[PDB]
Design a protein around this motif. Sequence first.
Motif, PDB file in Angstrom:
ATOM      1  N   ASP A  66     -12.820  54.779  44.322  1.00 43.45           N
ATOM      2  CA  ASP A  66     -14.020  54.060  43.923  1.00 43.45           C
ATOM      3  C   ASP A  66     -15.129  55.067  43.664  1.00 43.45           C
ATOM      4  O   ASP A  66     -15.496  55.835  44.560  1.00 43.45           O
ATOM      5  CB  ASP A  66     -14.442  53.055  44.994  1.00 43.45           C
ATOM      6  CG  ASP A  66     -15.596  52.177  44.549  1.00 43.45           C
ATOM      7  OD1 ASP A  66     -16.048  52.318  43.393  1.00 43.45           O
ATOM      8  OD2 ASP A  66     -16.049  51.340  45.356  1.00 43.45           O
ATOM      9  N   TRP A  81      -9.111  47.070  36.100  1.00 46.09           N
ATOM     10  CA  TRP A  81     -10.006  47.414  37.202  1.00 46.09           C
ATOM     11  C   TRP A  81     -10.326  46.252  38.131  1.00 46.09           C
ATOM     12  O   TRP A  81     -10.259  46.445  39.356  1.00 46.09           O
ATOM     13  CB  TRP A  81     -11.298  48.014  36.640  1.00 46.09           C
ATOM     14  CG  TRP A  81     -12.288  48.317  37.693  1.00 46.09           C
ATOM     15  CD1 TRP A  81     -13.472  47.687  37.910  1.00 46.09           C
ATOM     16  CD2 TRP A  81     -12.180  49.328  38.697  1.00 46.09           C
ATOM     17  NE1 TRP A  81     -14.117  48.247  38.984  1.00 46.09           N
ATOM     18  CE2 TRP A  81     -13.341  49.258  39.485  1.00 46.09           C
ATOM     19  CE3 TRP A  81     -11.214  50.287  39.002  1.00 46.09           C
ATOM     20  CZ2 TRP A  81     -13.563  50.110  40.557  1.00 46.09           C
ATOM     21  CZ3 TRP A  81     -11.437  51.131  40.066  1.00 46.09           C
ATOM     22  CH2 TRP A  81     -12.600  51.037  40.832  1.00 46.09           C
ATOM     23  N   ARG A  85      -9.231  46.386  41.993  1.00 45.87           N
ATOM     24  CA  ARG A  85     -10.304  46.547  42.963  1.00 45.87           C
ATOM     25  C   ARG A  85     -10.245  45.465  44.029  1.00 45.87           C
ATOM     26  O   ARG A  85     -10.365  45.750  45.224  1.00 45.87           O
ATOM     27  CB  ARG A  85     -11.656  46.529  42.257  1.00 45.87           C
ATOM     28  CG  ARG A  85     -12.819  46.731  43.199  1.00 45.87           C
ATOM     29  CD  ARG A  85     -14.124  46.871  42.451  1.00 45.87           C
ATOM     30  NE  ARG A  85     -15.204  47.231  43.359  1.00 45.87           N
ATOM     31  CZ  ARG A  85     -15.875  46.361  44.098  1.00 45.87           C
ATOM     32  NH1 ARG A  85     -15.615  45.064  44.048  1.00 45.87           N
ATOM     33  NH2 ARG A  85     -16.832  46.802  44.910  1.00 45.87           N
ATOM     34  N   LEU A  94     -10.118  51.050  49.270  1.00 42.16           N
ATOM     35  CA  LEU A  94     -11.001  51.861  48.451  1.00 42.16           C
ATOM     36  C   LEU A  94     -11.302  53.180  49.145  1.00 42.16           C
ATOM     37  O   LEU A  94     -11.358  53.263  50.373  1.00 42.16           O
ATOM     38  CB  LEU A  94     -12.310  51.129  48.169  1.00 42.16           C
ATOM     39  CG  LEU A  94     -12.257  49.937  47.222  1.00 42.16           C
ATOM     40  CD1 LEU A  94     -11.373  50.255  46.038  1.00 42.16           C
ATOM     41  CD2 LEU A  94     -11.775  48.696  47.939  1.00 42.16           C
TER      42      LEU A  94
END
Length: 144
Positions: A66, A81, A85, A94
């Motif tokens: 990240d 993404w 994420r 992350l």
Amino acid sequence: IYVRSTKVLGAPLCLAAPAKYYAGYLSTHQLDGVYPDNWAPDNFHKREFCLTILPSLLGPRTFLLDVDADRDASYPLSVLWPQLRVLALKSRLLLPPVALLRRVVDPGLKPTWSADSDAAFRALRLSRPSSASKPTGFDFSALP
RNA sequence: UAUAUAUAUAUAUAUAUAUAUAUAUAUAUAUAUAUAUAUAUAUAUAUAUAUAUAUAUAUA
């Protein structure tokens, strides 16, 4: 794998036979595009970490970096993404970029076991002692 | 009326020529396909020459 088309995905694509058969069956630029794959392989090495643009199953030994900035809109995989994420978020996978500098990886800022007070962390100390007599005496397009 | 000769017409037979049709063969022309040769262009490989770059060695 043996294929009958150029539009393939996942592995380097090279001619099975010498170019004489594909000539006429294909054209110059097409015949050109496969040349690196005709002698594709190069080795991969077993260091502590390996970055990759290739996605993978997020898990105990795979992490999502990240950076806290917008993706490259032109980069074809930026659309992945959000899904990546959120999956990392729901499992705490992350990694802030600073974590990479530590001797052992952990997702977090201001850890107990490390004061994070070292010359490596201080980005202001940009240094360039090495040289290679390369044409880029400087590449004035790259800016830190 | 009779016989013989000549001419003309008609019928029948044989031969030749010409026209038309059909079959077969040969020649020539045109088209298409296949093969071979030669020329020209393009691509790839190999050899030789010349130039440039890089590496290594030796000398200054």
